[PDB]
């Protein structure tokens, strides 16, 4: 791989420079190189991996949605035939998006999850596994779709089980996992009641634990609690 | 339009 | 080239889809493919070429500025030695930016400028030649720098001579050329007085011609006149 | 910070 000759610390340093420059494709390539050195990632390094790939796949998902909507307007009654180009270009962006998700999933499987023993690393990686299967599910239409949805659900569920045994209800990883699994239920699994129940229980259990926190921890937890309440406001 | 976790 | 098998009209159609999806690298690759079909570009197709490459090089220029500023903070008295990584990464983004500029310049030279006989096409391409030599000048530091600056100046000057013979003073191409050549004088050529004189004469000659325009032409011209006045406000 | 032509 093209980063094989670069020191691990230099890859981390350049990932941070790439973030500052809003060069997220470079950031992701640097962090892939760092993971492929074979050492476990620190907390900060796990968050650089997540920021890089979330920005890359976020642009692809936004593009895919725009193209899918145009392809939808084209298959309506009265719409002029314009040829294969919209489908072809949606397919090109879809394939690229699937490739990024497969790359992240492959890093998690080789070998980040198997080496992750502490709750804060293992939950973080299992959440990421759920997230990138969720992004695959957003574009899935084939014989595959049920198994991709179940892979997302399974990863999220294992992360949830660990988080509820090992982390306080205010832990930001635990909160963001619950937030994302609730969105999985709403947007992917056709389970809006499950989505709403999880968001409300998560919010209420975090509320009750805020008294234990420092000012800085309180700010970290309440930021994600607000996202839970924003979804509940949208959904109810 | 669902809010997911911020990176 | 990878677009050689795609119809010209399909490349144009996909460039527009890529714009809507904010996929500017794809947009630029589609428009490069369209130019390489060898036919002249329409007005709309020239503006798709310009939008695509301006967005690609704009992201690279923004990243280069962030990295150059960090590399500047590193060469100050008291700054800790952090190794070659900032310079290496600035160099990587610089090389990529130079590659995009060389690609645009190569399309203009093979063969868009030589085939462009109407004032509206020839001025547009010569302006673009000045612009991408200007972006090369922004990062030039070598034995090359004077010749790159002179190449920008020469292209802009030929565009200016044609525009003042062949176009009204309100023509948006003529206005945007003058705007950009004024920025060349201010930012590249160390000629702020020339920059200010050109911006003010351009603005005043356009003001005097607005009475001839339709409401829609008036809106197009006044939008670029406001950019001239915004620069004059910054510079005086 | 100079304004150049909008694409
Ligand atoms: Cl395509
Ligand atoms: Cl580099
Ligand atoms: Na090493
Ligand atoms: Na078509
Ligand atoms: Na371990
Ligand atoms: Na614990
Ligand atoms: Na053809
Ligand atoms: Na270093
Ligand atoms: Na011609
Ligand atoms: Na004319």
């Amino acid at each position: 791989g093209a980063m094989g000759s670069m020191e691990r610390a230099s890859l981390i340093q350049k990932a941070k420079l790439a973030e500052q420059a809003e060069r997220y494709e470079d950031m992701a390539a640097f962090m892939k190189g760092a993971v492929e050195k074979g050492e476990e990632l620190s907390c900060e390094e796990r968050n650089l991996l997540s920021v890089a790939y979330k920005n890359v796949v976020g642009g692809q998902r936004a593009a895919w949605r725009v193209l899918s909507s145009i392809e939808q307007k084209s298959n309506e009654e009265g719409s002029e035939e314009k040829g294969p180009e919209v489908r072809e270009y949606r397919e090109k962006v879809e394939t690229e998006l699937q490739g990024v998700c497969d790359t992240v999933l492959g890093l998690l499987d080789s070998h980040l999850i198997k080496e992750a023993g502490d709750a804060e690393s293992r939950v973080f990686y299992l959440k990421m596994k759920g997230d990138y299967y969720r992004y695959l599910a957003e574009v899935a239409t084939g014989d595959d779709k049920k198994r991709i949805i179940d892979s997302a659900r399974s990863a999220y569920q294992e992360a949830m089980d660990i988080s509820k045994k090992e982390m306080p209800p205010t832990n930001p990883i635990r909160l963001g996992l619950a937030l994302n699994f609730s969105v999985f239920h709403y947007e992917i699994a056709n389970s809006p009641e499950e989505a709403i129940s999880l968001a409300k229980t998560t919010f209420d259990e975090a509320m009750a634990d805020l008294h234990t926190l420092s000012e800085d921890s309180y700010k970290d937890s309440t930021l994600i609690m607000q996202l839970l309440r924003d979804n509940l406001t949208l959904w109810t | 339009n669902a809010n997911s976790s911020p990176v």
Side-chain angles (χ1 to χ4, degrees), chain A residues 1-76 78-142 144-236, chain B residues 1-6:
Chain A
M3 300 302 171
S5 62
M6 206 187 305
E7 286 282 13
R8 189 186 188 284
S10 298
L11 288 163
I12 298 304
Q13 185 185 355
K14 291 180 183 176
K16 290 174 189 174
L17 292 171
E19 185 182 18
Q20 290 173 264
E22 298 172 79
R23 291 276 293 195
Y24 295 108
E25 182 180 47
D26 289 350
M27 190 187 181
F30 294 138
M31 289 309 302
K32 176 173 190 294
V35 168
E36 290 175 348
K37 298 303 179 183
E39 300 287 354
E40 296 185 37
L41 303 191
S42 71
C43 183
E44 177 170 12
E45 292 162 357
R46 290 191 300 268
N47 288 95
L48 291 168
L49 178 70
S50 176
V51 164
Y53 280 107
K54 193 70 200 326
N55 277 274
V56 171
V57 81
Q60 296 171 317
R61 289 166 70 205
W64 186 95
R65 287 199 292 270
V66 165
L67 299 170
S68 183
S69 176
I70 293 169
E71 185 180 15
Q72 281 157 25
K73 291 191 178 202
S74 85
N75 292 319
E76 286 180 337
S79 287
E80 269 304 309
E81 176 59 43
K82 292 304 178 203
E85 293 85 358
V86 169
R87 174 188 55 74
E88 284 169 355
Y89 189 44
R90 187 273 295 155
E91 286 171 353
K92 178 209 183 76
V93 172
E94 186 169 299
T95 299
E96 195 190 278
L97 182 159
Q98 290 172 321
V100 168
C101 293
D102 291 346
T103 292
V104 172
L105 292 169
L107 294 172
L108 294 171
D109 202 46
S110 298
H111 299 276
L112 289 170
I113 289 170
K114 72 174 56 61
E115 297 197 350
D118 291 355
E120 296 63 37
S121 58
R122 191 166 187 84
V123 173
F124 187 96
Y125 293 133
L126 289 167
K127 176 188 172 289
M128 192 173 206
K129 183 174 182 173
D131 287 338
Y132 285 82
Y133 275 113
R134 170 164 60 85
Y135 308 148
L136 289 176
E138 287 178 343
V139 303
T141 61
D144 72 322
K145 191 180 190 207
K146 285 175 178 166
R147 276 182 284 268
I148 290 164
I149 291 175
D150 203 63
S151 289
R153 178 199 64 69
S154 178
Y156 285 135
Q157 188 63 59
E158 184 184 345
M160 288 289 297
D161 292 345
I162 298 166
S163 75
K164 288 183 272 156
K165 285 166 192 143
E166 298 298 344
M167 292 171 161
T170 48
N171 177 281
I173 303 164
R174 178 166 167 181
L175 288 175
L177 163 64
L179 177 72
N180 288 13
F181 191 25
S182 163
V183 172
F184 169 84
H185 288 306
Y186 195 93
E187 287 194 348
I188 309 297
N190 194 209
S191 303
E193 289 175 333
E194 188 69 15
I196 291 160
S197 186
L198 178 54
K200 176 168 176 31
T201 286
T202 302
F203 184 97
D204 291 348
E205 290 159 34
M207 277 301 260
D209 190 56
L210 289 173
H211 74 273
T212 67
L213 301 184
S214 69
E215 172 167 324
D216 287 0
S217 291
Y218 168 95
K219 285 167 174 158
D220 294 334
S221 296
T222 57
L223 185 81
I224 307 165
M225 291 172 67
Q226 182 64 52
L227 301 175
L228 290 165
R229 182 137 63 183
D230 290 345
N231 287 347
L232 285 165
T233 296
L234 184 65
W235 295 342
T236 66
Chain B
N1 44 30
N3 297 280
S4 73
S5 70

